[PDB]
Ligand binder design. Structure first.
Ligand SMILES: O=P(O)(O)C(O)(C[n+]1cccc(F)c1)P(=O)(O)O
Ligand SMILES: O=P(O)(O)C(O)(C[n+]1cccc(F)c1)P(=O)(O)O
Ligand SMILES: C=C(C)CCOP(=O)(O)OP(=O)(O)O
Ligand SMILES: C=C(C)CCOP(=O)(O)OP(=O)(O)O
Ligand SMILES: [Mg+2]
Ligand SMILES: [Mg+2]
Ligand SMILES: [Mg+2]
Ligand SMILES: [Mg+2]
Ligand SMILES: [Mg+2]
Ligand SMILES: [Mg+2]
Lengths: 362, 362
């Protein structure tokens, strides 16, 4: 796609700015400059650019219905691309760290960054921090004189905080809350009492939906100066809903999508994650299916994983999925219709974000 | 000290604000709220509060020479305390991550946060991210209407970036630069060619001096609205110098200060760090001392560490230290004298920052 290529060309412009500044102001040597260029490419590139292109999309919609000079148009699109990369970089940050936390092997068809031989965990932790730090650097550089600066920084930060909180809910999702204590080593849950739709929903809300949908959508709004022309509560609701769905697909794919197609190797069963599979399964299983799940979940033994996977196929979960989706389709279209009242153009953009999410195969 | 107690009472006010907001806006449960309260206390408290009290100090100086209402005075001091905690929290962030990276066991007389049984590395990585994220949260809350907001955020960010860059120079300080490559596992240096005063100085400049001295000093200036009444290049120079010295002491203590007094267990020899000890030693050793250093450095074997430590004692390094210090004393006092031209009050505060650093025993 031509538009994707234009968004990538701003990546080259950002990277070259970031690296020239390391050299001219942070006394970097060529090899450390090289390491961070490979780090940026391996961690920030190779994905779908969903979040980034979302901001471009939202901006493009408002441009098509609003009077601007040619140069202003080019500036808005360039801002949209820069904000998109802020988000793509903030995601790169969370991915680097999350891949350590989850004990993952593969990401975007390559070894997880921390698994690169010349990286290791200890460098990758700090490489992760650099990625987020790059987001603020590129913000202050690119947007210093922009009227939306304060708004964008305050939002960005809030979204970032929420992701980090969400990551905490996620990584402690297999511990009984009552047992959670920094001083005592957490034994995994035996009851699974906390594998509920309500609790699963709090996890995903925080760890996913803010950075994945809210941020890109509001960001495209800021760069167009169009945030006053929308009902913000609707934008928030639609973002959390679509974002939720996106995570359900992600959870399904962990288990049932071949790594050749996913570009990652699944670990939720092994990690004992509070995933949609586990929660939907515990929501319909009989007493003996539950007991067999309990005897096998959260263990790296390939034979126990196999048992958990066989349990999922048997429990006919893609019927629960089809209902779940049918329901999400209802509420999303409903929100889209509600969005048309103040902002038909924005509503279109949400329809396009939803079409692409709904249709994704990786 | 009474002043320290007043600064801590703002910590209780910040913590209670942070935790009430987790509950009322992020749907936290009491036990996860409890975990993060212990996390904040264990990671943010128990230190010297040097960086935090520095901002209080700088503000206190300007207050003593400037006309303000009582309420304004109380607001400035409260801002100074909030900015101080931003920095203490940003340090807590770097410490949590750094302790993972360095394979450290003890910090402030307690197991390193990641070594708490109910923590582990994977939670501590994300606990670290939360700590930094808390800094921006408390900034936007406490300072939303303050004229210095943009200035403080832009500085903060720059200082944060520099720390992360510095951490990269530090953690890759035992690799030959030419060999550095994400795809190939780094073999430690055999030549030590890069253990130079110049290179050691670039490391410390970035990883230490910005967050440790520049940030607290400029921050106290911002909260007093007094940044126009100083020569900024002098503040920068004094900060990098004192900051450097501070890191030299830190490096000396790693090796020669009993963990009972340090509150940490040293790892630089084992980690093969480009420390002042190693660099000063390579700067004076004879051919056979160098060879014995090469055969023993960067290895966890207690007997090889012993050999490196014996080499340090023999090479009479506390003579090099005494010269190094005598020199730093010259240049610091020189800068202090230069600072008196525009800002005698600020110059006093720097003298007090220096006296306390110079005199520290942990
Ligand atoms: O399947 P992955 O590992 O790509 C994941 O979606 C990443 N991820 C998602 C949300 C927040 C985050 F920091 C990271 P998950 O949550 O680990 O399943
Ligand atoms: O002796 P430590 O481990 O307290 C140290 O001073 C921490 N520290 C210092 C500077 C930056 C940083 F992120 C962390 P060092 O550098 O590991 O020696
Ligand atoms: C489910 C989430 C939020 C993490 C994976 O994100 P994506 O699947 O969008 O990642 P890339 O295409 O960017 O790899
Ligand atoms: C040398 C540096 C910068 C890290 C240790 O910092 P401090 O020795 O000031 O840490 P605390 O008193 O805050 O533990
Ligand atoms: Mg993951
Ligand atoms: Mg994860
Ligand atoms: Mg997943
Ligand atoms: Mg350390
Ligand atoms: Mg260190
Ligand atoms: Mg040290």
């Amino acid at each position: 796609m031509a538009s994707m290529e234009r968004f990538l060309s701003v990546y080259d412009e950002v990277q070259a700015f970031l690296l020239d500044q390391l050299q001219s102001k942070y006394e970097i040597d060529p090899n450390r400059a090289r390491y961070l260029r490979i780090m940026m490419d391996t961690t920030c590139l190779g994905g779908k650019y969903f979040r980034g292109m979302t901001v471009v999309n939202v901006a493009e919609g408002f441009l098509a219905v609003t009077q601007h000079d040619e140069a202003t148009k080019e500036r808005i699109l360039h801002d949209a691309c820069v904000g998109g990369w802020m988000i793509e970089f903030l995601q790169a940050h969370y991915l680097v760290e999350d891949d350590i936390m989850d004990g993952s092997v593969m990401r975007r068809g390559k070894p997880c960054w921390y698994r690169f031989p010349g990286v290791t965990t200890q460098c990758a932790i700090n490489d992760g921090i650099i990625l987020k730090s790059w987001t603020q650097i590129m913000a202050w550089h690119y947007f210093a004189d922009r009227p939306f600066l304060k708004d964008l920084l305050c939002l960005f930060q809030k979204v970032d905080y929420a992701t980090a909180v969400g990551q905490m809910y996620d990584v402690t999702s297999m511990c009984d809350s009552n047992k959670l204590d920094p001083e005592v080593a957490q034994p995994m849950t035996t009851d699974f009492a906390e594998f509920t739709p309500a609790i699963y929903k709090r996890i995903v809300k925080y760890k996913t939906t803010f950075y994945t949908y809210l941020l890109p959508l509001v960001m495209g709004l800021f760069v167009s100066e169009a945030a006053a022309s929308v009902e913000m509560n609707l934008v928030e609701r639609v973002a959390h809903l679509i974002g939720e769905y996106f995570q359900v697909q992600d959870d399904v794919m962990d288990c049932f999508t071949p790594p050749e197609q996913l570009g990652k190797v699944g670990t939720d069963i092994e990690d004992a994650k509070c995933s949609w599979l586990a929660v939907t399964f515990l929501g319909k299983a009989n007493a003996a299916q539950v007991a067999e799940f309990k005897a096998n979940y959260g263990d790296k033994d390939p034979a126990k994983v196999a048992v958990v996977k066989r349990l999922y196929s048997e429990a006919n979960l893609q019927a629960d999925f089809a209902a779940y989706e049918a329901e999400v389709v209802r509420e999303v279209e409903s929100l889209i219709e509600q969005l048309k009242v103040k902002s038909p153009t924005f509503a279109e953009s949400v329809a396009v974000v939803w079409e692409k999410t709904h249709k994704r195969k990786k």
